[PDB]
Curated annotation (Swiss-Prot):
Catalyzes the reversible hydration of carbon dioxide. Can also hydrate cyanamide to urea. Stimulates the chloride-bicarbonate exchange activity of SLC26A6. Essential for bone resorption and osteoclast differentiation. Involved in the regulation of fluid secretion into the anterior chamber of the eye. Contributes to intracellular pH regulation in the duodenal upper villous epithelium during proton-coupled peptide absorption. Its EC number is 4.2.1.1, 4.2.1.69. One of its GO terms (cellular component) is apical part of cell. It is linked to Osteopetrosis, autosomal recessive 3: A rare genetic disease characterized by abnormally dense bone, due to defective resorption of immature bone. Osteopetrosis occurs in two forms: a severe autosomal recessive form occurring in utero, infancy, or childhood, and a benign autosomal dominant form occurring in adolescence or adulthood. Recessive osteopetrosis commonly manifests in early infancy with macrocephaly, feeding difficulties, evolving blindness and deafness, bone marrow failure, severe anemia, and hepatosplenomegaly. It is an enzyme of class 4 (lyase). This is Carbonic anhydrase 2. Interacts with SLC4A4. Interaction with SLC4A7 regulates SLC4A7 transporter activity. Interacts with SLC26A6 isoform 4 (via C-terminus cytoplasmic domain). Changing L193 to E/H/R: Strongly reduced CO(2) hydrase activity.
Amino acid sequence: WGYGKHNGPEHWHKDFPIAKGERQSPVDIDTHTAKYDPSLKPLSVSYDQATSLRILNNGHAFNVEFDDSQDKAVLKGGPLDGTYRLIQFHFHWGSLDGQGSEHTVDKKKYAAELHLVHWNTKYGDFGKAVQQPDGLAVLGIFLKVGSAKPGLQKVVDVLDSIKTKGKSADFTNFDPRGLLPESLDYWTYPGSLTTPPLLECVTWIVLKEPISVSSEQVLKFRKLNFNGEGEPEELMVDNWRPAQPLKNRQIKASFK
Ligand SMILES: Cc1ccnc(S(N)(=O)=O)n1
Ligand SMILES: [Zn+2]
């Protein structure tokens, strides 16, 4: 599977039939249809002890991985029951500033989207968690092109060392708090992984406020490769799944 014409999103359902399922992601967020829930708790993002380990090009995106062997970087509150531990983040982005995000907002595409992936600690580890309907919480953050995000630069600068599929590099002491916007206002809905295996295990929490990154920063994302070392170059761009049918779901807002 990939993002090309012959193996991309419209093909995924053949190997992964859940692609046509009842709670797939991403979705368009219609901001006028979303229901304010005065009941939803504030989101709690506690990344003060987050310990990054490694950054990896997996042929689809790049992952910054975290040591999730203790409660160190956790998400709780909001729509969530219990505690979810950060395991990794990655991005989806476009070939042009006009596209790249997976979720859309009133059909607006952003230049990219950051996914901070967390697993429910009641299931003990990530592999067991993805088999559960409430196994994961993914915090999604839109990126627009404008002013630079200083806290992103350390990620940008290491991408030259992981240009091709399979390459990884040490990436310790990275603070994901530098990737967060001011506001934690959010939309939330039940959905899925947005890449194969497309498992319907995610509580999505999508922040309303985008972060700004510079054109130069996102241009460096676009220098990555889908292919491995020594292979014909295919730029890693447009690694986003388009919006899927909302079906029997309601998107809730934490704000009015
Ligand atoms: C870890 C993982 C696998 C597949 N998809 C996702 S995503 N894009 O839904 O966050 N994350
Ligand atoms: Zn993702």
